[PDB]
Design a protein around this ligand. Sequence first.
Ligand SMILES: OC[C@H]1O[C@H](O)[C@H](O)[C@@H](O)[C@H]1O
Ligand SMILES: OC[C@H]1O[C@H](O)[C@H](O)[C@@H](O)[C@H]1O
Ligand SMILES: OC[C@H]1O[C@H](O)[C@H](O)[C@@H](O)[C@H]1O
Ligand SMILES: OC[C@H]1O[C@H](O)[C@H](O)[C@@H](O)[C@H]1O
Ligand SMILES: OC[C@H]1O[C@H](O)[C@H](O)[C@@H](O)[C@H]1O
Lengths: 146, 146
Amino acid sequence: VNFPNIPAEGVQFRLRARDTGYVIYSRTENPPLVWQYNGPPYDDQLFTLIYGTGPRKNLYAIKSVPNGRVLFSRTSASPYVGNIAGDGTYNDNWFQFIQDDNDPNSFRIYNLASDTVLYSRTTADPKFGNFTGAKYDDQLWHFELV
Amino acid sequence: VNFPNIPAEGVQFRLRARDTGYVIYSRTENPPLVWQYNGPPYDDQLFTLIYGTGPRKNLYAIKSVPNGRVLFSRTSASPYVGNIAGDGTYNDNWFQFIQDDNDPNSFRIYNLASDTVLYSRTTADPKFGNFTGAKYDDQLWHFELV
Ligand SMILES: OC[C@H]1O[C@H](O)[C@H](O)[C@@H](O)[C@H]1O
Ligand SMILES: OC[C@H]1O[C@H](O)[C@H](O)[C@@H](O)[C@H]1O
Ligand SMILES: OC[C@H]1O[C@H](O)[C@H](O)[C@@H](O)[C@H]1O
Ligand SMILES: OC[C@H]1O[C@H](O)[C@H](O)[C@@H](O)[C@H]1O
Ligand SMILES: OC[C@H]1O[C@H](O)[C@H](O)[C@@H](O)[C@H]1O
């Protein structure tokens, strides 16, 4: 089931993991360019959504406010999670927000092209990344409105 | 996770529900044109897949062997599940096969356009159709190669 409370197109938000409380950031310089962060609000944590239409209905591109790059999540090459210029040129730029089976207020950030979800953990490296497989709580996210 | 044993393009199969054991048919006369069936093998129970590419990567059109029409699953108009000529002209002709979280040998027939899954049951009318909501066992399918 698609998450019922997806931010309106163009509305700004942070993506915060339910369990770690870490936020995603997306920047242009200094690897890792997309990663997680525990600390104060910065502009590279701000995103908006481009709403997919036609064949991309129910999918969304996640665009970074300061730099305008969209997120990707792939299994084909490293880095697996990153950003790229444009408004969603590549199929791996398109995400579905899938409501959790148990928790109605959180969702998985799912990539149809790569069959992956994003995760945030405090355990082992890599502490942020993507994953194809079973459902774990560390894959659960909130939209944090600003 | 995508079902790991999806038939190769052009390979013929029936779609059989795990629990009811009923099969899907797709025909051109006598509504419902797409429904479930408990009885002898007929050709209108035979399907192949058209593999999606680009924006349709990991989606598939489900094509009738005898009549060539593809399945659709929608919520915009009746019938909600039906068929239409072509090779997946419309967005709601495109399905993802999502492996069950508990049973690795079955999958849901999921529609990205409508956020629905197909179900087969013996209980309440309509006994076959599409559904947006919680995971139930009556939503579980097998590919039955012929
Ligand atoms: O969206 C990121 C983009 O990056 C690379 O350049 C690949 O060629 C693409 O397939 C895609 O993964
Ligand atoms: O969701 C990512 C997932 O991947 C790892 O392999 C761990 O075993 C899980 O605990 C979880 O962190
Ligand atoms: O597969 C369903 C099957 O059932 C009906 O009763 C018809 O007589 C057959 O032609 C076929 O459509
Ligand atoms: O794919 C089936 C097709 O059927 C209808 O006639 C509509 O025109 C389309 O939007 C689609 O629902
Ligand atoms: O998967 C369809 C689903 O829909 C119905 O409303 C029932 O409550 C469930 O038992 C199941 O049949």
